[PDB]
């Protein structure tokens, strides 16, 4: 039996439900995103929204509703998840320490059932007597809010009404009253209900139930004054209230149907109404007074906003501020204005929230030569398509690059006394210094007067009083902002030269040889306070200012040319507090002091790569809690930078990192550039909140990205992507996309939108005949619609669009890869096509071409015709391996360029999906699962072993290692295919065996070689066996792996255990949520081991760590069973973020 | 603007799943129900000592229920190749076998033949357990059973009537109530709705025994064939009434009914061909089919998209092509065979069939799983003074 480890890096982006309320006060209004299994709580403000907690919860969110009950202050938050999972929580903050903390949980899954057919649906009532779901077809389960119900348990009462729709709680009712709509044979209908939970039982409410259009679909709770509900269809809204019945019907809303709503305003004037199309309507309610005190509905009022990308759900925000959710694109935060655009809309988006789903295609390559590689998926459709890199570690975006090799350190310099932010940057350089003057977006060369230009600056920065400290090998030159000029200079009594400094705001160190000076920073004057002297010379020294004090540190730190270790000196007289070795081969090059979330630490990095830090005590100057990362074989530097409004530190190295803090614990992620030797801050007009990087070459100055794990870069095409892979000889990536073009009456054709396939640099046509003998019947029709497809270049470096070439009229091209062919070491853009049309089921022709991109133009290198649609294509040990129809062949590389077949494997029905390893290929069926087929040299055919018999319908597949082979489930289960060295007979042999059952909850649509974090390129060193990632239809993308018998044991009693203990948002319980799962039954996991679970250790705030260690027993991977602390948690966690 | 059928769309449209169209799966089934039946693998399955197997329907991925001529009801996991009785339910009163097994169109409850062949026994799905007590309605043998709806079935019997047995919401409702908070599943008892005969034709009225039922849950129709010869048409949306008759080309060994929802069209076995029947048609205008296996009988029928699949007493099974309108052949028309299976060499077959050591299983029931490539076949002897069983997963 195999067993395979999976775990999420990626967590979902995709939208699934979005709520208004007060949330996290009684005064702020709060906007709440539910992404799958994520739930994300922002903070509304005219700004826009601001994200103060997230949460990963076991399960998928199906409901999430905002409800107050009697003594409450604050909305409280339901969620109900697709696995049956209960649960109320309640926004807890105290100090800088945010979570949220379950009020009440419990599982509704019921043993025997049909799961409803309209989706997982859930109700508040007003007045916070009951939860209203709808689970299973014809049974309403109730939960009751009593105060004192921990357990939400759930009744079925029986409703006569089996399908429904939606449902909603009508409001101004005395008893708790239900309206919905449900769809009957002789059309859709609205009807209402009292719900008695005494009697378990729905009595008739207080209104018959009315015919509505038979699209309805759609319900809206309709708040006092107002009451009632609002039914929305296809054409027309109707409203119901007693004896009140209203409808209209805006020719507006025809096109497109109404999916989502969310209410306006408090009172229950206007709501949202969103749909698939991305048109916002907003809805209004004319208000009439009763002659008996109440207020009801007028009329009904519905107006276009403008268009948006597709909606999932909708939440209004606060002046006129619109956010839409998008489960299929990225989500959008609106603004709603008086004016309209030239398009004729109102709405203008302020901000987008990266959504990398739907991913249809994804490949890793390593770009920069690391060893890691970078995965580049395609996600999105139409004018929502774009390109999403994600790579292990913190983006930050080039702006600007300098030619300016050989820098030794960066520091920035307020020459302006009247301005904050900063306006010069000094290079150090060995012999020489220079200066560049910071002009917004522009850097350029310049000299600061004042400043030594002859000799090597070792640290510069802004000093209190208006000043610019420099040291250099000769002296201590203060200069004075304003004129610019020299105030106070200080020399080395030794007449040595100065090999090390730092400064600070009143502060300044220097080590000359073995001696260091502590200098005190006066109004024009400089002045000699002590000094000491090492046993060795010092390599390197901080005294870096830490927490919220003014520019002070009474510390220094300290690194030696000789011991190779890091040491803590107390200012001025040098005390010696603490000595920490360092070990390795090359002596220390940096020393840093810095804070992270007003916590104090140390870190030195040392010359062959290595960098420890430890926890730092500034009041007694001692080092604890010592760590030891290997970030790479080239020198490594610290330097602390302000970015984000918060503290962090960049590593400079041949795989630079960012040390940044996440829920109060240090994570170490690398970053996506080439390599780094120097960095410092950088806060002017132009870069605020910026990095400048010093490589080996050049230097590059940009702007960090939102700090999380895993970083998104996007490079929008505004057509659809549907196929993507790399060129390692040219630097490219290919991709295949798509645009929409009417065809007008003189029989060409205009595109609707630009896109990247017609905004490109460069652009060509395919002039290939083979597909001219045949014309689509409607080939001269006006106003259809006509699909174009185009291979998009972009460079692997700056992912911008180099060139596009369009394929042939009715040709559509259905796979990409892109490998070293034969003996060739270049590598081919090789293309699948077929020749489509809407009368034929499947095509007969097609063709596969190679294209070669060099000198910035893609020029076609060779066709091969094929007898039928080419669906993927794979490199199989410097072969073409091709999918066409219902046959897989292999395709050798001949000397002319030429694809020819050598062999082939007729038994399947259609093959979709190629990856191969080694000298196996897995082959994703239509219907048929997944096959097991090994290539035989020495024979030059295939022969089919196994196939699994469990049928599915893939939509991809890859191999995890010669026997334990990767698929997923449409029912949002994982599955891995072993051959069954064990059988002895045919029909075991033929049968691919199940290793386990896996419930992800999350539908795999990509599956690909290779690692977001360092592979290990064949090395056995890695305690795991093999690296395939997957994307998900919502945008997550996660690792699977091999594990031996011993890790599978050793982390199957730990997540037992840890299923018990961990209390996740909602405290629900995580071994049902892995548990196998299907429509027709649930089964316990088996066989993988969920790193999900752990890694949710990091997301509970630390009040939760304790209690959840508390009786734990933990096994630290020597076998070992003790009791767990806060840190063990976390410190395998920061080890599971460097295996994928 | 032309509609477009190709796969080419699906493939791309799924990758997104942006609003893509249902209209698809019509020709993704299709095309693999052409290329599916001559790719199949066998799977036999030791059943030990039952009798014969006369019906099984899908309940999971992994297994597949089947009744048998002694009144046991099993289950085959075909996933882990593992055989699971089900305990027979006792009737009200104690006072053959099981020839038919149908799902209610909800999937939550199964119908089969109980310890006394002439009730019938409700069975909770997934779990298996007791529903309902065995009725008494029929005064003979049930040979048929279909599922009109979620919570009303029809039973058939040997003397032509159907028996109509309707659960009402408080019944349904406190039964699962039981079911889902008592781990002990308790029972409710029941007795048949109403009991009508099938209409009296010209054809012979004495052979009137309904041997097969089938729903279209599309125009809520309820089908039946007899062995007079003839093919009745009922309304089951609501009630149970006659709405036609029409003439079957063939009288003998009309013993298995299937309908095609993708063509209105009901499948009517007999002793060589398969009748095509369509109630909007004159009663005379029937068309049969040759199975090319004279002499055995036709025992099973079922629609796959557009391909028949017919089982026949010598233990094969052919696959006839709606869209071609001719069988499918192999890569010589294409079928399936049984396996040996286990046969008892018992005191009858000594007395009537001592000349014969192996008798070839006759496909008696066969049936495809949710995706339409596995599909389950078993069986037994054709003889009926023979005792033995078969049973395989061919995917």
């Known amino acids: 039996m195999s067993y395979n480890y999976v775990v999420t890096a990626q967590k979902p982006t995709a939208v699934n439900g979005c709520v208004t309320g007060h949330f996290t006060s009684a005064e702020d209004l709060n906007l709440l995103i539910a992404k799958n299994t994520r739930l994300e709580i922002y903070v509304v403000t005219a700004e826009g929204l601001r994200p103060v907690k997230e949460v990963g919860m076991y399960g998928k969110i199906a409901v999430m509703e905002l409800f107050r009950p009697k003594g409450e202050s604050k909305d409280l938050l339901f969620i109900l998840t697709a696995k049956y999972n209960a649960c109320i929580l309640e926004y807890k903050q105290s100090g800088e320490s945010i979570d949220i903390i379950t009020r009440a949980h419990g599982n509704v899954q019921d043993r025997i059932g049909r799961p409803s057919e309209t989706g997982i649906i859930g109700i508040i009532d007003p007045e916070c007597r009951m939860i209203g779901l709808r689970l299973y077809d014809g049974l309403f389960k109730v939960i009751p809010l009593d105060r004192d119900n921990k357990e939400l348990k759930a009744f079925n009462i029986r409703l006569e009404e089996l399908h429904v729709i939606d449902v909603k709680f009508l409001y101004g009712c005395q008893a708790p009253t239900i309206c919905f709509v449900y769809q009957d044979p002789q059309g859709r209908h609205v009807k209402t209900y009292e719900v008695s939970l005494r009697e378990k039982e729905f009595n008739k409410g207080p209104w018959k139930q009315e015919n509505v259009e038979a699209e309805a679909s759609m319900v809206i709770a309709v708040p006092e004054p107002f009451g009632g509900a609002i039914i929305i269809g296809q054409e027309s809204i109707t409203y119901h209230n007693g004896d009140k019945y209203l409808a209209i019907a805006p020719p507006i809303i025809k096109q497109s149907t109404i999916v989502c709503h969310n209410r306006v305003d408090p009172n229950g004037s206007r709501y949202l109404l969103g749909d698939m199309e991305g048109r916002l309507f907003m809805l209004l309610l004319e208000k009439e007074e009763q002659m008996d005190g109440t207020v009801t509905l007028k009329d009904l009022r519905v107006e276009l906003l403008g268009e948006t990308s597709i909606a999932e759900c909708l939440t209004y925000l606060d002046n006129g501020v619109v956010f839409v959710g998008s489960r299929l694109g990225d989500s959008q935060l609106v603004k709603l204005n008086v004016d309209s655009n030239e398009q004729g809309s109102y709405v203008v988006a302020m901000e987008t929230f990266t959504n990398l789903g739907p991913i249809v295609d994804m490949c890793v390559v390593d770009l920069e030569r690391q060893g890691q590689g970078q995965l580049v998926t395609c996600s999105g459709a139409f004018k929502e398509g774009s390109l999403r890199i994600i790579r292990n570690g913190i983006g930050i975006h080039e702006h600007a690059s300098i030619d300016l090799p050989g820098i030794k350190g960066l520091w920035p310099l307020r020459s302006d006394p009247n301005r904050e932010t900063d306006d010069t940057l000094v290079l150090s350089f060995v012999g020489q210094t220079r200066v560049l003057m910071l002009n917004g977006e522009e850097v350029e060369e310049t000299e600061l007067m004042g400043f030594v230009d002859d000799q090597q600056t070792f640290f510069c920065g802004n000093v209190a009083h208006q000043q610019l400290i420099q040291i250099t090998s000769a002296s201590v030159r203060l200069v004075s902002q304003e004129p610019k000029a020299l105030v106070s200079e200080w020399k080395e009594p030794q007449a040595k030269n100065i090999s090390v400094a730092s400064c600070n705001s009143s502060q300044v160190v220097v080590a000359v040889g073995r001696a260091l000076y502590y200098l005190q920073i006066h109004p024009q004057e400089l002045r000699q306070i002590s000094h000491t002297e090492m046993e060795h010379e010092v390599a390197c020294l901080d005294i870096t200012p830490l927490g919220d004090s003014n520019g002070l540190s009474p510390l220094c730190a300290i690194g030696l040319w000789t011991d190779i270790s890091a040491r803590i000196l107390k200012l001025p007289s040098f005390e010696l507090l603490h000595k920490e070795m360092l070990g390795g081969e090359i002596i220390p090059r940096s020393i840093l002091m810095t804070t992270f979330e007003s916590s104090h630490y140390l870190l030195c990095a040392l010359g062959d790569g290595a960098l420890f830090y430890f926890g730092l005590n500034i009041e007694t100057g001692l080092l604890s809690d010592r760590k030891k990362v290997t970030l790479g074989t080239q020198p490594t530097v610290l330097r602390t930078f302000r970015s984000l409004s918060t503290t962090n530190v960049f590593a400079c190295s041949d795989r630079p990192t960012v040390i940044y803090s996440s829920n109060h614990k240090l994570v170490f992620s690398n970053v996506n550039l080439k390599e780094v030797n120097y960095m410092c801050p950088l806060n002017s007009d132009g870069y605020p909140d910026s990095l400048a990087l010093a490589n080996n070459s050049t230097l590059t100055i940009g702007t960090i990205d939102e700090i999380q794990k895993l970083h998104i870069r996007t490079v929008p095409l505004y057509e659809s992507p549907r196929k993507i892979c790399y060129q390692e000889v040219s630097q490219c990536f290919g991709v295949l996309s798509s645009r929409i073009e009417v065809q007008d009456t003189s029989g060409g054709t205009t595109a609707l939108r630009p896109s990247a396939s017609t905004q490109a640099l460069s652009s060509s046509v395919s002039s290939s005949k083979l597909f001219s003998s045949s014309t689509a019947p409607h080939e001269t029709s006006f106003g259809e619609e006509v699909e174009v497809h185009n291979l998009l270049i972009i460079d692997q470096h700056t992912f911008e669009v180099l060139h596009a070439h369009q394929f042939l009229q009715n040709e559509y091209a259905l796979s990409l890869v892109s490998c070293k062919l034969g003996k060739d070491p270049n590598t081919y853009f090789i293309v699948g096509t077929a020749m489509v049309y809407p009368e034929e089921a499947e095509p007969k022709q097609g063709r596969i071409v190679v294209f070669q991109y060099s000198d910035g133009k893609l020029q076609t290198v060779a066709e091969k015709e094929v007898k039928g649609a080419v669906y993927s294509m794979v490199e199989f040990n410097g072969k073409l391996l091709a999918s066409i129809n219902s046959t897989v062949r292999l395709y050798e590389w001949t000397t002319e360029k030429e694809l020819r077949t050598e062999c082939n494997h007729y038994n399947n029905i259609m093959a979709l999906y190629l990856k191969t390893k080694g000298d196996f290929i897995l082959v994703g069926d239509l219907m048929r699962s997944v096959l097991l087929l090994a290539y035989k040299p020495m024979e030059g055919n295939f022969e089919e072993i196994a196939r699994d018999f469990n049928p599915n319908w893939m939509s991809a597949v890859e191999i995890l290692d010669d026997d334990n082979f990767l698929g997923a489930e449409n029912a949002f289960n994982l599955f891995v295919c072993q051959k069954d060295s064990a059988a002895t007979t045919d029909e075991e042999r033929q049968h691919l065996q199940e290793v386990g059952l896996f419930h992800l909850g999350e539908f795999v649509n990509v599956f690909c070689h290779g690692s977001l974090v360092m592979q290990n390129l064949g090395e056995t060193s890695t305690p795991t066996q093999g690296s395939v990632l997957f994307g998900t239809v919502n945008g997550m993308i996660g690792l699977v792996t091999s594990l031996s018998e011993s890790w599978y044991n050793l982390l199957l009693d730990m997540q037992n255990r840890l299923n018990k203990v961990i209390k996740s948002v909602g405290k629900i319980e995580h071994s049902f949520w892995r548990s196998f799962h299907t429509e027709r039954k649930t089964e316990p996991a088996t066989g993988f081991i969920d790193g999900d679970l752990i890694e949710s250790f990091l997301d509970i705030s630390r009040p939760k760590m304790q209690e959840v260690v508390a009786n734990l027993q933990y096994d630290d991977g020597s076998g070992m069973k003790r009791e767990a602390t806060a840190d063990d948690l976390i410190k395998v966690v920061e080890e599971l973020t460097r295996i994928h | ?395």
Request: charged share 20%.
């Open chain 2, 1 to 395: 603007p032309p509609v477009k059928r190709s796969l080419v769309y699906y493939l791309k449209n799924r990758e997104v799943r942006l609003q893509n169209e249902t209209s698809y799966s019509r020709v993704l089934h299709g095309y693999a129900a052409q290329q599916l039946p001559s790719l199949l693998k066998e799977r036999e399955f030791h059943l030990g000592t039952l009798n014969k197997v006369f019906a099984s329907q899908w309940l999971n991925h992994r297994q597949v229920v089947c009744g048998t001529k002694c009144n046991t009801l099993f289950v085959v996991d075909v996933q882990t190749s593992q055989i699971t009785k089900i305990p027979i339910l006792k009737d009200r009163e104690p006072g053959c076998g099981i020839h038919a097994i149908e799902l209610n169109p909800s999937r939550t409850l199964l119908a089969t033949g109980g310890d006394n062949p002439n009730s019938l026994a409700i069975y909770r799905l997934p779990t298996l357990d007791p529903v309902c007590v065995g009725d008494d309605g029929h005064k003979d043998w049930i040979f048929s059973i279909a599922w009109i709806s979620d919570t009303m079935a029809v039973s058939g019997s040997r003397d032509g009537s159907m028996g109509l047995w309707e659960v009402t919401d408080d019944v349904l409702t406190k039964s699962d109530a039981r079911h889902n908070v008592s781990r002990v599943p308790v029972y409710a008892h029941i007795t048949h709705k109403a009991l009508k005969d099938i209409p009296k034709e010209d054809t012979n009225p004495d052979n009137c025994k309904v041997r097969a039922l089938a729903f279209n849950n599309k125009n809520k129709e309820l089908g039946a064939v007899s062995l007079d010869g003839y093919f009745h048409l009922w309304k089951a949306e609501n009630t149970l009434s006659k709405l036609l008759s029409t003439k079957l080309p063939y009288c003998r060994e009309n013993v298995c009914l299937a309908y095609g929802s993708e063509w209105s069209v009901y499948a009517v076995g007999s002793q060589a061909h398969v009748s095509f029947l369509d109630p909007r048609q004159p009663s005379y205008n029937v068309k049969s089919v040759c199975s090319r296996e004279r002499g055995s009988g036709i025992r099973s029928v079922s629609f796959y998209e557009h391909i028949i699949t017919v089982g026949t007493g010598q233990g094969s099974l052919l696959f006839y092509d709606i869209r071609a309108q001719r069988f499918l052949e192999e890569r010589e028309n294409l079928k399936l065979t049984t396996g040996k299976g286990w046969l008892n060499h018992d005191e009858t077959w000594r007395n009537y069939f001592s000349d014969i050591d192996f008798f070839p299983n006759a496909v008696y029931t066969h049936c495809y799983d949710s995706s339409g490539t596995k599909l389950f076949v078993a069986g037994g002897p054709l003889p009926s003074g023979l005792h033995g069983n078969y049973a395989g997963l061919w995917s």
